[PDB]
Amino acid sequence: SVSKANVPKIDVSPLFGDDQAAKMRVAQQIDAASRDTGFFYAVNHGINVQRLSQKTKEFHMSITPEEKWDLAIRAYNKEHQDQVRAGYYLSIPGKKAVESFCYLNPNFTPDHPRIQAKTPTHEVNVWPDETKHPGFQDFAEQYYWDVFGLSSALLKGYALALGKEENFFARHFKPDDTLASVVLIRYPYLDPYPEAAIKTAADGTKLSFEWHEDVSLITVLYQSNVQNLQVETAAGYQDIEADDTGYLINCGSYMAHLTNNYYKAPIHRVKWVNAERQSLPFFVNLGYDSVIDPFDPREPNGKSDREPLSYGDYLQNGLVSLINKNGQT
Ligand SMILES: CSC[C@H](OC(=O)[C@H](CS)NC(=O)CCC[C@H](N)C(=O)O)C(=O)O
Ligand SMILES: [Fe+2]
Structure with missing residues (x-):
């Protein structure tokens, strides 16, 4: 009934290297995907995703109710x-099926200047007990840096795509201060599946999460091989095919602001599927004080009628509004 979205597979491996011409050919693919459905899969990304899925599975299945309140x-x-x-986002049996664990920059330590200042959106991560989840915290912190690495590469491609030098975004995306987050989302199999946990779209589609744009610069997402995502296009909502070997990449509304909607933040929603699955997003956020002057790559002089907006401002408002629009996750 619903047609397949165009989601190209892009080999992003030249973005890690020093072949500048080959990076420009990747940039072009990114530009094309960003102007079309707004989604692509990054392939040859270098991350061991099957291990990520295994380690994450072991956590979700072994965390106890007691631990969830302790980390909530x-x-x-x-x-x-x-x-x-940061911490645990509990399900409500009978009402809200999904649950998750979110963590931030491991460098947000008690001595970090932004943690000392109690600056909004900065927090010290909470972790379960090591003896109950051996290896988890170190794996998870390592994952943060591996996906951070991929995202820097990707931000070099988006920079080149937009006619900028390759450090245009990446110079604002720094280990010591990035507001980026990992969310380890568990979607359960449930029999019976409570109707109260299923939303219904205007078109009748059963959903786990309603339409939205992402609160990010870009989102770098690993999911299980279970089809679920739809993206709105001028031809209506289309199905994004699953690919649990690649990362699904899209732009968030910060990118849409900076580029004056040349790279839109695609509107998308999550269909209801009764399947035990994972959705493991990394939200690529800049630093609290990061400001990029907005521009327009469709205009000869590159000028925009949008005003500069600090990432920290964008993030704290965005995350509130998302909770308001679509509910506490
Ligand atoms: C957990 S609800 C459904 C889930 O959607 C989300 O995670 C939504 C839309 S991308 N994003 C959010 O709720 C933002 C999480 C931000 C995170 N807690 C943070 O502090 O960075 C999904 O896409 O499967
Ligand atoms: Fe999203």
């Missing part, structure tokens, strides 16, 4: 007032 964000545990972003 403020929205679920009012004792944990500093936990706005």
